[PDB]
Amino acid sequence: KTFFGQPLGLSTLFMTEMWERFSYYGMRAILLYYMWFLISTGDLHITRATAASIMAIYASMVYLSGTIGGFVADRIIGARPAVFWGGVLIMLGHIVLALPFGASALFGSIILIIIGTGFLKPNVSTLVGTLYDEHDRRRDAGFSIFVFGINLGAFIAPLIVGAAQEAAGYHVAFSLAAIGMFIGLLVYYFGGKKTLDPHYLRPTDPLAPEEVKPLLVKVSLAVAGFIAIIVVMNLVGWNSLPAYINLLTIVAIAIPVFYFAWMSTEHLRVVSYIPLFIAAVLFWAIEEQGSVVLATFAAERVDSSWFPVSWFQSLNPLFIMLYTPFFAWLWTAQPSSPTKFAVGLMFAGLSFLLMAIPGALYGTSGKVSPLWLVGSWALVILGEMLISPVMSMWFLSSSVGSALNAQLVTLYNAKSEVAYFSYFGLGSVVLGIVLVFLS
Ligand SMILES: CCCCCCC/C=C/CCCCCC(=O)OC[C@@H](O)CO
Ligand SMILES: CCCCCCC/C=C\CCCCCC(=O)OC[C@@H](O)CO
Ligand SMILES: CCCCCCC/C=C\CCCCCC(=O)OC[C@H](O)CO
Ligand SMILES: CCCCCCC/C=C\CCCCCC(=O)OC[C@H](O)CO
Ligand SMILES: CCCCCCC/C=C\CCCCCC(=O)OC[C@H](O)CO
Ligand SMILES: CCCCCCC/C=C\CCCCCC(=O)OC[C@H](O)CO
Ligand SMILES: CCCCCCC/C=C\CCCCCC(=O)OC[C@H](O)CO
Ligand SMILES: CCCCCCC/C=C\CCCCCC(=O)OC[C@H](O)CO
Ligand SMILES: CCCCCCC/C=C\CCCCCC(=O)OC[C@H](O)CO
Ligand SMILES: CCCCCCC/C=C\CCCCCC(=O)OC[C@H](O)CO
Ligand SMILES: CCCCCCC/C=C\CCCCCC(=O)OC[C@H](O)CO
Ligand SMILES: CCCCCCC/C=C\CCCCCC(=O)OC[C@H](O)CO
Ligand SMILES: CCCCCCC/C=C\CCCCCC(=O)OC[C@H](O)CO
Ligand SMILES: CCCCCCC/C=C\CCCCCC(=O)OC[C@H](O)CO
Ligand SMILES: CCCCCCC/C=C\CCCCCC(=O)OC[C@H](O)CO
Ligand SMILES: CCCCCCC/C=C\CCCCCC(=O)OC[C@H](O)CO
Ligand SMILES: N[C@@H](CCC(=O)O)C(=O)O
Numbered sequence: 249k250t251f252f253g254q255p256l257g258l259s260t261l262f263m264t265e266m267w268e269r270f271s272y273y274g275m276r277a278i279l280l281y282y283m284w285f286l287i288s289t290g291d292l293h294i295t296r297a298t299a300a301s302i303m304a305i306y307a308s309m310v311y312l313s314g315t316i317g318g319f320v321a322d323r324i325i326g327a328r329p330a331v332f333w334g335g336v337l338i339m340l341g342h343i344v345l346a347l348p349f350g351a352s353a354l355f356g357s358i359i360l361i362i363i364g365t366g367f368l369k370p371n372v373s374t375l376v377g378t379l380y381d382e383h384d385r386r387r388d389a390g391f392s393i394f395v396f397g398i399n400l401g402a403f404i405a406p407l408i409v410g411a412a413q414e415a416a417g418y419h420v421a422f423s424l425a426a427i428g429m430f431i432g433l434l435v436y437y438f439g440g441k442k443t444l445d446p447h448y449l450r451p452t453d454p455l456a457p458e459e460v461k462p463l464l465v466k467v468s469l470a471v472a473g474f475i476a477i478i479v480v481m482n483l484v485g486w487n488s489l490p491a492y493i494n495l496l497t498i499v500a501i502a503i504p505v506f507y508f509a510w511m512s513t514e515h516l517r518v519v520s521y522i523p524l525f526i527a528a529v530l531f532w533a534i535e536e537q538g539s540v541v542l543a544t545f546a547a548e549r550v551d552s553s554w555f556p557v558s559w560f561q562s563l564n565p566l567f568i569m570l571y572t573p574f575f576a577w578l579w580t581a582q583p584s585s586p587t588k589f590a591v592g593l594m595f596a597g598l599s600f601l602l603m604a605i606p607g608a609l610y611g612t613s614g615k616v617s618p619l620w621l622v623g624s625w626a627l628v629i630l631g632e633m634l635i636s637p638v639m640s641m642w643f644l645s646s647s648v649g650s651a652l653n654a655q656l657v658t659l660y661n662a663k664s665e666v667a668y669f670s671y672f673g674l675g676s677v678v679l680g681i682v683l684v685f686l687s
Pocket of ligand 11: 355363487488489492493
């Protein structure tokens with residue numbers, strides 16, 4: 249008796265992550281429309297472009313947070329408490345949006361979910377590893393299943409939450425996201441006590457006595473530096489919301505740039521990763537624009553009067569679930585991995601070049617078939633299979649992509665739509681071609 253051949257403990261972690269991803273993408277699917285709503289009613293004083301930018305940098309900080317969450321668990325609080333308290337924070341994040349408040353609750357929600365997801369996401373992935381001995385052949389399949397649960401949650405969430413929002417309003421809808429996380433916590437807490445190794449209740453690599461001060465000094469100088477930059481920003485008058493978004497943008501992008509510089513055999517192999525890293529960043533940029541630019545296109549440019557427009561956010565994980573089996577049968581039934589990055593990026597590029605067509609053909613003032621978006625996601629997710637299944641800089645790439653997005657999505661609107669999709673679509677394809685030369 250197993251969970252699809254794997255230890256039953258995988259079900260617990262499967263469920264845990266499925267329900268967190270549910271809460272997250274349920275929130276993601278309507279948060280942009282929520283901010284629109286708050287703007288339309290005069291509660292939130294930003295442009296829609298800024299709103300879009302907020303979505304992107306939000307994602308960016310979530311993934312950035314995920315890059316330290318593993319450290320915090322491994323060295324300070326343990327993987328299992330990280331996941332639990334991570335989940336608690338996420339739930340609080342959604343509860344904050346379920347409360348009868350408006351724009352004033354957004355920052356609080358975002359911070360709670362940023363911190364919480366940073367604690368939970370990397371560490372739930374870690375606990376999946378813990379189900380297996382070093383020599384266990386099932387490890388790849390186990391993770392493959394675990395990834396299925398991520399998208400299962402990501403898939404039904406826009407459906408359920410979007411429907412709820414339409415039916416009962418945003419606050420109720422966001423409360424459902426809170427409930428989603430609560431369900432995950434329940435299964436995680438009680439299921440975890442039955443399946444998970446007690447060793448992970450504590451850090452497996454606790455800070456040695458002499459490691460504490462140096463860590464403390466490093467964090468302190470960073471926070472002080474960040475605070476100092478903000479002080480200077482405010483004295484010089486660079487204190488608009490977009491200004492803060494730019495600071496966050498710069499921080500998120502400077503982080504890999506500093507590792508670039510930081511680091512002849514091993515050299516030319518670190519240098520060799522840079523085009524790959526750029527490729528991943530650009531891919532995730534495009535992929536992460538699904539919930540922002542494509543979310544916007546869905547709401548403004550699509551014949552969608554008969555269903556909640558947030559449901560388009562289900563197309564992304566739907567296609568992942570559809571493609572993953574095929575690519576199992578395919579990688580065994582061969583392109584080099586850098587080549588896989590190029591083509592993955594090429595397909596992302598094509599997913600945007602496609603989107604240029606309805607506007608170029610039909611104009612951008614009318615509405616087009618939903619199939620355009622369906623095809624768009626079909627292409628980018630095809631790209632995801634090529635790059636995703638194939639260390640810090642890697643999970644950092646998605647944060648950098650979203651940071652880049654915080655800048656780029658503010659350029660998207662009906663007037664720029666065709667050029668936007670065309671140029672960044674063509675750019676990605678070309679850089680895919682560039683990678684081919686370098687492959
Ligand atoms: C396996 C991945 C390959 C799939 C990618 C190809 C997807 C291309 C889709 C283009 C079709 C969208 C337009 C068709 C349509 O319904 O037009 C009718 C009209 O109402 C459009 O405004
Ligand atoms: C204002 C919002 C309050 C949020 C409270 C949500 C509760 C947090 C997690 C629920 C997961 C189940 C936890 C079960 C549990 O801790 O058992 C209680 C006790 O046996 C443990 O010492
Ligand atoms: C690993 C930590 C990542 C850094 C955490 C800082 C990120 C904090 C907020 C993310 C950006 C959110 C800006 C949008 C926002 O807060 O909305 C506030 C309302 O619009 C107020 O006008
Ligand atoms: C006010 C936020 C409180 C929540 C804790 C967030 C974590 C804040 C400080 C933890 C110190 C993290 C420094 C270590 C680190 O990030 O290194 C990452 C390495 O790349 C992992 O190998
Ligand atoms: C801020 C309101 C929320 C308060 C949280 C409820 C606190 C109640 C009990 C604390 C539970 C601590 C257990 C955390 C943990 O390590 O989970 C691991 C489980 O044993 C399964 O992995
Ligand atoms: C050691 C890290 C754990 C601490 C997590 C930091 C939490 C930071 C901010 C959470 C506060 C969110 C509440 C804000 C809020 O409720 O909206 C404001 C009022 O309701 C306005 O009507
Ligand atoms: C103990 C933590 C688990 C809590 C999970 C979330 C459940 C909490 C509240 C559910 C209902 C939230 C209020 C819904 C709401 O007020 O929407 C109505 C709007 O105000 C419009 O009438
Ligand atoms: C209200 C701000 C609270 C923010 C707290 C941020 C803490 C950031 C990093 C924690 C580093 C210090 C950890 C101390 C610790 O427990 O390690 C002890 C050693 O492992 C001893 O075995
Ligand atoms: C956002 C972080 C703001 C900067 C301040 C971070 C300080 C947070 C925690 C540092 C506490 C000092 C670490 C030493 C410590 O408490 O460990 C206790 C020992 O592990 C007990 O044996
Ligand atoms: C981590 C270092 C942060 C960056 C330090 C750069 C310092 C450069 C100028 C600081 C000037 C602070 C007062 C300026 C001020 O009050 O207003 C200036 C005028 O509004 C425009 O120049
Ligand atoms: C995770 C703890 C590390 C500390 C980072 C916390 C976030 C710090 C700065 C981001 C603030 C984002 C802007 C929030 C805001 O509403 O300011 C907008 C002003 O109203 C400008 O008019
Ligand atoms: C030792 C490095 C010190 C400087 C670090 C670089 C980061 C400095 C500022 C972050 C970006 C601020 C740009 C402000 C901005 O975007 O425009 C201002 C607003 O749009 C107008 O209110
Ligand atoms: C395997 C499926 C691949 C589907 C993607 C193929 C897309 C190829 C070319 C699309 C280029 C559309 C740009 C049209 C354009 O820019 O016209 C400008 C008009 O004046 C509208 O501003
Ligand atoms: C199993 C793969 C089957 C092949 C799918 C690859 C799709 C290749 C090219 C699709 C061309 C994209 C342009 C769509 C298009 O131009 O149609 C316009 C609308 O039909 C207007 O009526
Ligand atoms: C089965 C996918 C799960 C649900 C995801 C929601 C995706 C939203 C729409 C996808 C299907 C669109 C309807 C198909 C179609 O032919 O378009 C009808 C339009 O009214 C034509 O203008
Ligand atoms: C193994 C993956 C399964 C394949 C899924 C790929 C499907 C991706 C996009 C489907 C949209 C293709 C357009 C359909 C179409 O041409 O219909 C147009 C109508 O006849 C309107 O004239
Ligand atoms: N779509 C995947 C990965 C997203 C990313 O890393 O940017 C998830 O939500 O788990």
